[PDB]
Each structure stands twice: as structure tokens, then as C-alpha cells.
Design a protein around this ligand. Sequence first.
Ligand SMILES: CCN1CCN(C(=O)N[C@@H](C(=O)N[C@@H]2C(=O)N3[C@@H]2SC(C)(C)[C@@H]3C(=O)O)c2ccccc2)C(=O)C1=O
Length: 262
Amino acid sequence: TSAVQQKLAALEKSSGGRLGVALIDTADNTQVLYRGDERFPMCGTSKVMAAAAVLKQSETQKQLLNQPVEIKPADLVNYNPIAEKHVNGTMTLAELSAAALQYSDNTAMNKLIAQLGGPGGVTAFARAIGDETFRLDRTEPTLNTAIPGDPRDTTTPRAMAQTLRQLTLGHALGETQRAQLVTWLKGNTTGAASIRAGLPTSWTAGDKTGSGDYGTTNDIAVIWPQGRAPLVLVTYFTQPQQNAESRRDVLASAARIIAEGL
Ligand SMILES: CCN1CCN(C(=O)N[C@@H](C(=O)N[C@@H]2C(=O)N3[C@@H]2SC(C)(C)[C@@H]3C(=O)O)c2ccccc2)C(=O)C1=O
């Protein structure tokens, strides 16, 4: 048990919930894990895998991202800030990817899932890039039930960090596609209270949040510290009761412990 791991355990102790952390410092490829191999509900953090899978398809079905997708009134789910504006019209797969990632639009996510042939199509992409842990089982919004002990729509912090590294800094995607993914993550609108809130102001980052029942509060990020090689950081958090409140502050604290321990 390292000093950083002990600090994360202390944070978890006062948090009321269960915390999972995985850092990969590309300066030396070292990792810092806390409950790194335990499963957590991904919620919206799964949107990165879906968008990346569509980016991979676009490497060979070249005009895929410009392909229109019909948005019907019945497609709308619980949170669709972008899709609702296009009901009875269309959005391209690039628009759907941007909406899913940057606004966490759930209807947009469902269109990515549908393009991939269902939740299993997202899992299939995960397997193709070496992630044997990730599993997407349901569409939005039920993939957010986040029931303790339920393996559906879960992953481990270790697996997600390795995957995010491969996708954003490695070669799981073509160069243009990796750049597009990084651009989308950097333009996220929903992350300032999470991982980012625990980083020095001078650092830059891209991230994708997730939230669900059981006060499930997640964030996965690629970070560029001042004067350092990039980091990949996953912070997952989930609580014992279905109606628990969101705790983005716990993710921010975890990120601060990680930054202070570099
Ligand atoms: C079948 C019954 N059932 C299961 C429970 N459930 C949900 O927990 N959905 C969450 C959700 O959609 N989360 C998606 C997600 O992650 N993103 C989007 S929304 C967001 C911007 C808060 C978030 C982000 O980026 O942080 C959600 C959480 C917190 C408040 C409202 C909704 C349902 O939706 C649902 O219907």
C-alpha cells in the first residue's frame, strides 16, 4: 500500500461509497491503482468506446461520419439536449458522436450503439483493441441502473485506463481519428467539477463524465500536465443506496491526491 493508495482509501472512508482509480503516467508507463480490478458501472463513460468504434469504422467506410441518421420523436430518451433539436430531421454520425461525448446526449449514444449493431457491437470493438474487461449490455437509459453487484455495463478502472490510453495516445485508431477523439474530449462541456477540479489550473485535459443511480459519479480523462508527459486517469465512484446524490467532489479530491503524488 503506497502513500497515494492510503490517501485514496482515506478519502473513500469518509465518502460513504466505493471508489475506483487507475492512473497511467506515460512519463514512465507506471500505474497507480485503487480497486483497479473491481467492476464499476460505466454509465456515460461508455460513450467513449462507442464513439471510438464509429471512428474506427470511418477509417474504411470513409464517408460514414457524414452519413445522416434520422431522429424520430420515439428515439428521444431521458436526456437529449442536442437530439431534441433535430427530431423529425437528421444528424450525421459526426454530429451524434460530438453530442454524445461533449453534451452526454443519450439519444446520440443510442444512435452510435445502433450503428454498431447493438450494445454487443461496442463490446466487440473493445475486444478488438485488447480490452477483455469492458462490457456494454444495454442501450440508454437503462445502462445507467448501476445496481451493486450487477456486471452489466461495467468495466474496471485498470481496463478503462489502458483503453483510454490506447485510443487517445496510442494507435488503436488511425492518426486522424485519434486526433478527432482528442479534440472531442478536450471540448467536453460537463467535466469542470470532476477530475479537472482536482488538477492544477495550468494543466489541460479532455474527459468524459458519467452518472447513474446509486449516486454513481464517474470521469475518465487524458491529461497534459505542465512540463510533463500526458497522463490517463479514471475515477469511478458508486454508493450503497439507489437514490444517493452525485459526488463529483469525491472525484476531484481523488484527482488532487493523484496530482499531489506525482
Ligand atoms: C431505467 C431507469 N433509469 C436508470 C437510472 N437512470 C440514470 O441514472 N440516468 C442517468 C443518465 O442518463 N446518465 C447519462 C450519463 O452518464 N450522463 C448522462 S446524463 C448526465 C449528464 C447526468 C451524465 C453525465 O455526463 O454525468 C442520470 C444520472 C443522474 C441524473 C439523471 C439521469 C436513467 O436514466 C433511467 O431511466
